[PDB]
Design a protein around this ligand. Structure first.
Ligand SMILES: [Ca+2]
Length: 854
């Protein structure tokens, strides 16, 4: 043919000239037309480099076509000679005559080509297309239907929107109006098989499948085998990388244990028992301490029924500590510290009865909640402040406000009574307490460069714990707002025991805590027990008008007090109000010569063939340290890498009585994640390189750091993250439905969508997944064949090691949080059929393209 408008057709009907996503077209993608023109008269053939945006030629509707014309004429593409001025486009819309819109669109293409020629390229055009698309609901975030858009929406301090989700569903249709994404189909996707609902017949917990990101299908037997691979890798990290051969993790902190198919908790325990013989052997179990993160108390029952393969997280204790001691006003009664925990500590004088558990005063998420509360308060009338309108500058402001507030007596935002919260936590029986990095150090400074105001108090308690804390526990109210928490000492079962251990006499502790800052001065009588009659006690911590004292300086009691002939200690107390104490804090320990360690060895406690973890004196001898904050800064030098700072300070952690070191998720972070902390990760096996470290450092540094901690006598756990991945670079056509966090369809402002093709980012995993994914399965099957014959509860089938996951994609995923791309990107023809390009591996339909380009 002679040259003309037919040259708008695609140069070729394949991927060499038409961008596509599994055969489907996106309105924001580009193609190579056969030719182009600046005037409608002279036409030039394209080269392979001359691509154009599809939105110059095709639109989802007449409405959007008219919007495109209007937008471009108003943003640098005006030309009166081609009938395109601000006034000629002022009133065009949906109802404009079709041939008029087509003619204006053709004329606009000529004006666009003039602009491309003037600018010697398409870079301005590309920005103008992206800017235009952002104004069209169906080609941008708003059509996804965020709960953020609802009238008078209140932002959630968690920083994520739970029920901003889409699920991936099966679609092997032959109907062109429905499309087909059968490559992403699954026979699994068993959702919400969480906690006691593992078998699908007890949803008493109602714990959700979905949190944020691309949710991994942990019911898929191939995925279950891949988790075993991943666990094996982390448990042998240094050896397997050729880094420090002692740089291997000992166990796990299990992220989001309430939001993943509970099969994976069974399977993790099975692996670690196969490898290390943990079940029925307390020494081996405790050397591989593992602990599950969760805020659902139903997990305690679940874990007990399973013989306690991991520790239960006693979140109840955290809320009790905060509600009783930490509020400014409306404090719950002091007696709640006795009863409102997974363990009742009124008179706890037995062992192997309590649910094996870990407890805390603070963790990284709780500090985050507080800071986001402050951000939301500081910047109201911003409903998307915790989504796309979040700015780091607000966090910086919040932190300045926080540090100033933390130092005050009358705190507006920060917790009251932090030292007393820790005094309770660190003296409690039947728990593994967890200390928080940000309570010892100012967590936004360079790593460990600045001690927190609370460093002296907390470390005093940490060292004293190792020396003194053992035996039975009794917690007793002394008046309506004051209690005494007493430990009777190593080998001292209760208040009437004489003691059976050489350290019985010189161990034990009294912790006095009150939460009424106006409490009248009075004398109180503390029962230290029959093992401790006529005995001298040192005033470890006492309260003063301005703070705390460690040598009885300006407090109500002297440096040493002595028990009477019954073991009663007489103490003077009153209410105080200062930055450290709102109420009262006192701690007493036996006077001793030199060093003492009341650690109970696991070889000396009862072993039970049906149990892995047991809550007894040996497990109680452990203490966890959370080594990171979300607000930890990027390091300013190699020396300031957290891994290097940790290695250099290994002896300090030992000196503080830390036995178990919880390391941040070490995975390669998604660069655009809010905190770059490692939970939003693009590669599960790359833990950083010298050239591209994570926030914390390189993999080589990590392995040397683990070895240094091992040398100091600690065990080390890695935060393992099976729930989600975030930041995949590969898009995939998936069929989706708008749901809440349980995958149930919802409406938002009366609107919904179901079974819609959506171009989610789903595909990737990096070179780490390519190299290491499934790499150890054959050797695991050879050494531990039971791993792949034990039938999982939720599915009734074993993990499947016959397929290696070298690359993640939708078939291994339950769904995703809304990705802010739009639900109407997928091109449909005027009759409703999905456009489709049959080429290469994409054979679901015959080729069907919009008339404007074929
Ligand atoms: Ca999940």
């Amino acid at each position: 043919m002679g040259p003309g408008t037919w040259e708008n057709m695609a140069f070729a009907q394949d991927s060499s000239a038409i961008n596509n996503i599994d055969g489907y077209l996106s309105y924001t993608d580009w193609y190579r037309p056969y030719g182009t023109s600046q005037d409608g008269k002279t036409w030039y053939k394209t080269t392979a480099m001359d691509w154009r945006p599809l939105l110059m030629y095709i639109w989802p509707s007449k409405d959007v076509q008219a919007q495109f014309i209007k937008y471009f004429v108003n943003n640098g593409y005006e030309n009166a000679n081609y009938g395109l001025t601000k006034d000629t486009v002022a009133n065009i819309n949906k109802d404009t005559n079709t041939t008029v819109l087509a003619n204006m669109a053709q004329n606009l293409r000529y004006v666009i080509e003039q602009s491309i020629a003037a600018n010697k390229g398409t870079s301005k055009l590309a920005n103008d297309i992206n800017s235009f698309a952002a104004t069209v609901p169906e080609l941008s975030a708003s059509s996804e239907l965020s709960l953020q858009s609802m009238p008078n929406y209140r932002p959630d301090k968690s920083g994520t929107i739970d029920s901003d989700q889409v699920i991936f569903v099966n679609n092997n249709s032959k109907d062109p109006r429905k499309g087909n994404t059968s490559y992403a189909d699954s026979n699994y996707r068993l959702m919400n098989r969480t906690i006691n609902n593992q078998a699908g017949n007890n949803n008493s917990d109602n714990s959700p499948e979905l949190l944020v990101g691309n949710d991994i299908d942990n019911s898929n037997p191939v995925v279950q085998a891949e988790n075993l691979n991943w666990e094996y890798f982390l448990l042998n990290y240094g050896k397997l990388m050729g880094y420090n051969p002692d740089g291997n993790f000992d166990g796990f902190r299990v992220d989001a244990a309430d939001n993943i198919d509970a099969d994976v908790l069974d399977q993790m325990g099975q692996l670690m028992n196969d490898m290390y013989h943990t079940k029925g052997n307390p020494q081996n179990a405790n050397d591989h301490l593992s602990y599950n993160e969760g805020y659902h108390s139903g997990a305690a029952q679940m874990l007990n029924e399973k013989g306690n393969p991991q520790l239960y997280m006693d979140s109840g204790e955290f809320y009790t500590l905060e509600n009783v001691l930490g509020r400014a006003n409306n404090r719950d009664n002091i007696g709640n510290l006795i009863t409102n925990s997974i363990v009742n500590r009124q008179n706890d004088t037995t062992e192997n009865e309590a649910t094996p558990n870990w407890s805390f005063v603070t963790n990284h998420d709780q500090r985050k909640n507080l800071i986001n509360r402050l951000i939301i308060k500081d910047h109201s009338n911003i409903p998307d402040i915790m989504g796309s309108a979040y700015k780091v500058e607000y966090a910086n402001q919040a932190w300045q406000e926080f540090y100033a507030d933390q130092e005050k007596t009358n705190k507006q935002y920060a917790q009251y009574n932090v030292p007393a919260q820790y005094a309770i936590l660190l003296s409690n029986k039947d728990t593994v307490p967890q200390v928080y990095y940000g309570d010892l150090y100012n967590e936004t400074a360079q790593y460990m460069q600045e001690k927190s105001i609370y460093y002296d108090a907390i470390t005093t308690l940490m060292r004293a714990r190792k020396q003194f804390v053992s035996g039975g526990q009794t917690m007793t109210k002394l008046n309506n707002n004051l209690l005494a928490s007493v430990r009777y000492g190593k080998g001292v079962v209760d208040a009437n025991s004489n003691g059976t251990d050489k350290l019985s006499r010189t161990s034990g502790m009294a912790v006095l805590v009150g939460n009424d800052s106006n409490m009248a001065q009075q004398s109180v009588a503390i029962n230290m027990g029959r093992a401790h009659a006529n005995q001298q006690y040192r005033n470890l911590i006492d309260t003063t008008e301005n703070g705390l004292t460690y040598d009885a300086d300006n407090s109500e009691n002297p440096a040493i007090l002595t028990t009477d002939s019954n073991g009663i200690l007489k103490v003077t107390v009153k209410g105080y109000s200062n930055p450290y104490v709102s109420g009262y804090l006192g701690v007493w320990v036996p006077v001793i010569s030199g060093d003492q360690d009341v650690t109970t060895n696991a070889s000396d406690v009862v072993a039970n063939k049906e149990k892995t973890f047991e809550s007894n004196a040996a497990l109680d001898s452990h203490m966890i340290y959370e080594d990171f904050s979300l607000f930890q800064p990027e390091p300013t030098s190699v020396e300031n890498h957290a891994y290097n700072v940790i290695a250099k300070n290994a002896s300090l952690f030992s000196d503080l009585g830390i036995t178990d070191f919880w390391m941040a998720p070490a995975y390669t972070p998604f660069g655009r994640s809010r905190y770059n902390e490692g939970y939003s990760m693009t590669d599960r096996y790359n833990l950083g390189t010298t050239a591209n470290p994570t926030k914390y450092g390189s993999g080589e540094e990590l392995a040397n750091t683990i070895a240094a901690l091992h040398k100091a006598g600690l065990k080390v756990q890695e935060d393992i993250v099976m729930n989600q991945m975030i930041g995949f670079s590969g898009q995939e056509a998936v069929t989706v439905t708008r749901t809440n966090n349980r995958g149930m369809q919802i409406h938002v402002n009366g609107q919904t969508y179901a079974n819609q093709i959506y171009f989610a980012y789903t595909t990737g995993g990096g070179n780490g997944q390519e190299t290491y994914g499934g790499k150890y399965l054959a050797e695991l099957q050879k050494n531990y064949p039971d791993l792949f014959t034990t039938k999982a509860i939720s599915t009734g089938v074993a993990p499947d090691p016959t397929v290696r996951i070298n690359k993640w994609s939708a078939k291994y995923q339950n769904g995703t949080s809304l990705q802010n791309i739009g639900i109407g990107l997928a091109v449909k023809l005027a009759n409703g059929d999905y456009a489709y390009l049959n080429s290469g591996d994409n054979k679901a339909f015959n080729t069907l393209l919009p008339t404007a380009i074929s």
